[PDB]
């Protein structure tokens, strides 16, 4: 993380912590531009300690008095009912063993199920042809070419390209 974008990680949560405490909507909305004037103290300057002392005093009065049980937007890392839908929980590929008269239903769905597998069954003449080439030695985050230079299939095929939908 860099020093300039360290301002941005605080700036969104500076106002996000405030609407936890408000009672109206305009009461929170009146303090948006009102807090903006403090942000408009040093508009554009150098990147040295003058920009760090604006953040070094943003240690206090940001963590100091921070969010007394705030809003959480319940579908989140925290919050209630964040992972509540777990009786279903999307068991993708639980459907290998059937021993049919249980595979009687959905006839066209299984006919398409084996169809997509040939896209995964034939990708390593193309994906592994660039997997040895795109990585220089052992370097950074290893996504492929996002078109794979002819046809990107996927590169992340198929557990990510057919990833779990929510309900």
């Amino acid at each position: 993380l860099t020093h300039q974008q360290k301002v941005l990680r605080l700036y969104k949560r500076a106002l996000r912590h405030l609407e936890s405490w408000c009672i109206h909507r305009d009461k929170y909305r009146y303090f948006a531009c009102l807090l903006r004037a403090r942000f408009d103290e040093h508009k554009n300057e150098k990147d040295m300690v003058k920009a760090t002392q604006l953040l070094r005093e943003a240690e206090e009065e940001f963590w100091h008095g921070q969010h007394p049980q705030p809003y959480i937007f319940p579908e989140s890392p925290g919050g209630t009912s964040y992972e509540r839908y777990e009786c279903y929980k999307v068991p993708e590929w639980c459907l290998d063993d059937w021993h049919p008269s249980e595979k009687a239903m959905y006839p066209d769905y299984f006919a398409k199920r084996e169809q997509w597998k040939k896209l995964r069954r034939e990708s390593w003449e193309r994906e592994v042809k660039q997997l040895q080439e795109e990585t220089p030695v052992g370097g950074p985050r290893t996504e492929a070419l996002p078109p794979a230079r002819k046809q990107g299939d996927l590169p992340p095929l198929w557990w990510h390209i057919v990833t779990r939908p929510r309900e």
Partner: protein, 90 residues
């Protein structure tokens, strides 16, 4: 960022295409298969409640004559004296 531009364009043509694939129900694809197959209020409650009445009452009438402690009902709690006795009370 210009790097992921070709990303998430073919992924929408793969993931939502898989969801276009996943949205699939050919003529309500249940077979089921084979085979088949208010006012009454005649036997839905009569099998429910009206039958076990006689069985358990037989289990109590055939119980008091066998066990020496049947129902152990308490005293009278009577303030005057009444016709069940011969005397009265003021």
């Amino acid at each position: 960022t210009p790097e992921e531009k070709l990303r998430l364009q073919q992924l929408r043509e793969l993931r939502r295409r898989w969801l276009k694939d996943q949205e699939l129900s050919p003529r309500e694809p249940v077979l089921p298969p084979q085979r088949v197959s208010t006012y009454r209020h005649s036997i839905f409650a009569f099998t429910h409640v009206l039958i076990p009445v006689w069985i358990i009452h037989y289990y109590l009438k055939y119980h008091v004559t066998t066990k020496p402690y049947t129902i152990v009902e308490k005293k009278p709690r009577i303030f005057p004296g009444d016709t069940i006795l011969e005397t009265g009370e003021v």
